[PDB]
Amino acid sequence: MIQAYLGLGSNIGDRESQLNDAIKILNEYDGISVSNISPIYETAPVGYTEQPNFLNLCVEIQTTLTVLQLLECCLKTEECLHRIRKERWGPRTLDVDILLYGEEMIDLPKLSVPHPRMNERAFVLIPLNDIAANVVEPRSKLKVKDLVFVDDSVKRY
Ligand SMILES: Nc1ncnc2c1ncn2[C@@H]1O[C@H](COP(=O)(O)CP(=O)(O)OP(=O)(O)O)[C@@H](O)[C@H]1O
Ligand SMILES: Nc1nc2[nH]c(SCc3ccc(Cl)cc3)nc2c(=O)[nH]1
Ligand SMILES: [Mg+2]
Ligand SMILES: [Mg+2]
Ligand code: NA
Ligand code: NA
C-alpha cells in the first residue's frame, strides 16, 4: 500500500460538482482508496493567458496500483468528465495530476513524479499542506510545510 497525493483542477462547467464527481470515481477504482481531501480553493490561472479561475484541491489516496496503473485511472477519470483536448490549451472540466507517489521519483516519457511544477505552485502547495504538511517531497527533501508559501491568488472557496 502506497500513500499518494493527487492534484485536481476544474475551470469550466460546474467546477465543484465535477471535482466531487471526480473524487467519487477515483475512490471507486479497485486499488485506490481516497483517505483525505483538502479544502477547495479558487485559484488564479498560471502559466498561460487570462483564463477562467480554477477550483483546485488535493486528495490523499492509499493505493496498491503501480504509478502507471494510477496514471491510467487518473486519465480515465478525466475522460469520464468529458475533458476536451484541442490543438491549444484551454479551460478543462477536470485535470487529475499525480503529485507524489510515496517517496518515489519517476521520470518516464509519459509520467514525471513528483510533478515537475508542484514546488512552485501555490494552487498545489496550499491545499497539499492541508493534508500532507509532514510528507517529504523527495527531490527537494523538504516537507510540504517547508515548501508552502503565502499567495493571495489562492483563496478558500
Ligand atoms: N505527474 C503527472 N500526472 C499526470 N499526468 C502526467 C504527469 N506527468 C506527466 N503526465 C503526462 O502529461 C500528459 C498531459 O496531461 P495534461 O493534463 O494535459 C497536462 P496539465 O496537467 O494540463 O499541465 P501541468 O502538468 O502543468 O499541470 C498526460 O497524458 C500524462 O501522460
Ligand atoms: N490556478 C491554476 N493554474 C493552472 N495552470 C495549469 S497549467 C497551464 C494552463 C492551461 C490551461 C488553462 Cl485554461 C490555464 C492554464 N494548471 C493549473 C491549475 O490547475 N490551476
Ligand atoms: Mg495540471
Ligand atoms: Mg494534468
Ligand atoms: Na477503491
Ligand atoms: Na522525461
Side-chain angles (χ1 to χ4, degrees):
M1 198 87 98
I2 301 299
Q3 185 155 261
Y5 291 90
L6 307 184
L8 278 66
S10 183
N11 70 338
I12 194 163
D14 182 343
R15 297 171 298 162
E16 185 180 6
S17 178
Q18 295 164 147
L19 291 170
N20 291 332
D21 283 358
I23 293 166
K24 172 172 205 307
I25 292 165
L26 287 158
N27 186 60
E28 289 181 344
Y29 296 102
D30 282 344
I32 297 171
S33 303
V34 173
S35 51
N36 208 353
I37 305 154
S38 72
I40 302 178
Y41 292 84
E42 187 157 46
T43 68
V46 298
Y48 203 46
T49 50
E50 295 291 326
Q51 293 294 335
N53 292 316
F54 282 84
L55 299 190
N56 283 115
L57 58 77
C58 299
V59 169
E60 185 183 79
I61 64 175
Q62 305 306 320
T63 188
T64 51
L65 300 177
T66 65
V67 73
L68 287 166
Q69 292 168 338
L70 176 60
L71 177 66
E72 186 177 15
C73 296
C74 294
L75 299 183
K76 183 178 179 180
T77 302
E78 292 176 347
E79 294 161 11
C80 294
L81 275 294
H82 296 163
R83 173 154 171 191
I84 299 167
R85 323 200 52 103
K86 281 171 187 283
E87 182 165 359
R88 285 170 185 281
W89 307 339
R92 62 280 312 271
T93 52
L94 184 67
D95 185 41
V96 186
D97 291 348
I98 300 166
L99 302 175
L100 297 170
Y101 182 90
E103 309 261 53
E104 304 306 308
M105 295 170 56
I106 310 301
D107 175 21
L108 296 166
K110 75 190 135 181
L111 183 61
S112 307
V113 177
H115 188 287
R117 289 164 284 285
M118 62 170 280
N119 288 2
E120 289 171 40
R121 282 169 162 194
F123 77 79
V124 170
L125 292 175
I126 291 180
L128 188 58
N129 182 66
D130 292 330
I131 66 172
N134 289 297
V135 175
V136 174
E137 191 285 299
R139 299 170 299 157
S140 67
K141 298 173 189 183
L142 297 177
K143 292 177 172 203
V144 172
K145 72 195 185 177
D146 298 317
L147 286 160
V148 69
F149 52 90
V150 181
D151 195 306
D152 53 17
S153 78
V154 171
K155 286 186 152 58
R156 283 288 284 265
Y157 177 70

